Design a protein around this motif. Structure first.
Motif, PDB file in Angstrom:
ATOM      1  N   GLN A  99    -101.505 -89.943 -62.397  1.00 26.00           N
ATOM      2  CA  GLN A  99    -100.290 -89.979 -61.594  1.00 26.00           C
ATOM      3  C   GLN A  99     -99.537 -88.653 -61.666  1.00 26.00           C
ATOM      4  O   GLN A  99     -98.577 -88.438 -60.927  1.00 26.00           O
ATOM      5  N   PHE A 100     -99.979 -87.762 -62.551  1.00 28.72           N
ATOM      6  CA  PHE A 100     -99.280 -86.498 -62.761  1.00 28.72           C
ATOM      7  C   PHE A 100    -100.127 -85.257 -62.465  1.00 28.72           C
ATOM      8  O   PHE A 100     -99.600 -84.255 -61.982  1.00 28.72           O
ATOM      9  N   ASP A 101    -101.426 -85.305 -62.749  1.00 29.18           N
ATOM     10  CA  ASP A 101    -102.282 -84.162 -62.428  1.00 29.18           C
ATOM     11  C   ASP A 101    -102.932 -84.331 -61.054  1.00 29.18           C
ATOM     12  O   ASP A 101    -103.441 -83.371 -60.478  1.00 29.18           O
ATOM     13  N   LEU A 102    -102.904 -85.556 -60.537  1.00 31.41           N
ATOM     14  CA  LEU A 102    -103.346 -85.832 -59.173  1.00 31.41           C
ATOM     15  C   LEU A 102    -102.325 -86.706 -58.446  1.00 31.41           C
ATOM     16  O   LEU A 102    -102.629 -87.841 -58.076  1.00 31.41           O
ATOM     17  N   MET A 105    -103.119 -88.274 -54.722  1.00 33.03           N
ATOM     18  CA  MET A 105    -104.156 -89.286 -54.550  1.00 33.03           C
ATOM     19  C   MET A 105    -103.651 -90.655 -54.997  1.00 33.03           C
ATOM     20  O   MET A 105    -104.038 -91.156 -56.053  1.00 33.03           O
ATOM     21  N   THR A 106    -102.784 -91.246 -54.179  1.00 33.05           N
ATOM     22  CA  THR A 106    -102.160 -92.536 -54.470  1.00 33.05           C
ATOM     23  C   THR A 106    -103.187 -93.634 -54.733  1.00 33.05           C
ATOM     24  O   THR A 106    -103.039 -94.428 -55.663  1.00 33.05           O
ATOM     25  N   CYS A 111    -101.107 -98.608 -61.012  1.00 33.23           N
ATOM     26  CA  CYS A 111     -99.699 -98.968 -61.152  1.00 33.23           C
ATOM     27  C   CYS A 111     -99.465 -99.830 -62.395  1.00 33.23           C
ATOM     28  O   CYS A 111    -100.392-100.476 -62.883  1.00 33.23           O
ATOM     29  N   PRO A 112     -98.225 -99.828 -62.919  1.00 33.07           N
ATOM     30  CA  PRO A 112     -97.874-100.646 -64.087  1.00 33.07           C
ATOM     31  C   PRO A 112     -98.264-102.115 -63.934  1.00 33.07           C
ATOM     32  O   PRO A 112     -98.682-102.744 -64.907  1.00 33.07           O
TER      33      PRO A 112
END
Ligand SMILES: [Cl-]
Length: 218
Positions: A99-102, A105-106, A111-112
């Motif tokens: 979620q931080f380095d890519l 790309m959702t 997700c949590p």
């Protein structure tokens, strides 16, 4: 290992932190480089050297890059198919890291909600078939608690906590173990990328596990 019955088989599954460069062609148990050079190999060495009588059979099922999504897909063959007495699971780092380095790309992101649901489901299916199940929290080697990724990693860790409590799993606070270490050194001393540490960092992980299972000292 007080927590572990004698002659028991422990299967440890997770990402590259569990993998640690093992030879996957052997299948977790074997003669040469079956456990890699990480905390799993440290646990195996520690338990053999200090508790030879206990005769614990450790299996490394760590796969690099894995999320909890990847774990569920191979759970049947890599966990249940080995008939373990105990299962140790450490997952969430890659779930958070992508979620931080890519960030764009959702589709790739876990997700949590998916993380909890999947993690809880794996445990729910595994808890009755084993003598015990150990959940090792994901970590980020970063003392800054308001860092976007550290705070996010804390979200997933807490989520793993409420799953462990819900099924009576043993929870190893690896993140807290690193937090204690980081009172004396900067993250760079352990890991340039604050994720893949040197042997000292893996020893921190291993010692958290041993302490939680009551076989740190001898
Ligand atoms: Cl990884």
């Amino acid at each position: 290992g007080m927590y572990f019955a004698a002659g028991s088989k422990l299967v440890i599954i997770g990402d590259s932190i569990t993998d640690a460069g093992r030879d996957k062609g052997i299948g977790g148990e074997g003669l040469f480089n079956a456990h890699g050079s990480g905390y799993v190999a440290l646990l195996n060495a520690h338990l053999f050297a200090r508790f030879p009588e206990r005769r614990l059979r450790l299996v490394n099922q760590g796969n690099s890059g894995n999320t909890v999504r990847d774990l569920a897909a191979r759970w049947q063959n890599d966990v249940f198919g080995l008939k373990p007495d105990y299962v140790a699971m450490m997952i969430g780092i890659n779930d958070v890291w992508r979620q931080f380095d890519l960030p764009l790309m959702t589709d790739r992101h876990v997700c949590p909600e998916e993380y909890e649901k999947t993690l809880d489901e794996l445990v729910a299916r595994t808890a009755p078939t084993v003598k015990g199940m150990i959940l090792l929290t994901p970590y980020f080697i970063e003392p800054n608690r308001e860092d976007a990724m550290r705070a996010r990693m804390d979200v997933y860790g807490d989520l793993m906590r409420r799953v462990a409590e819900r099924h009576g799993c043993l929870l190893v606070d690896v993140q807290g173990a690193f937090d204690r270490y980081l009172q004396h050194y900067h993250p760079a001393q352990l890991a340039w990328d604050r994720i893949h540490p040197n042997l000292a960092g893996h020893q921190v992980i291993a010692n958290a596990f041993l302490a939680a299972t009551g076989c740190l000292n001898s």
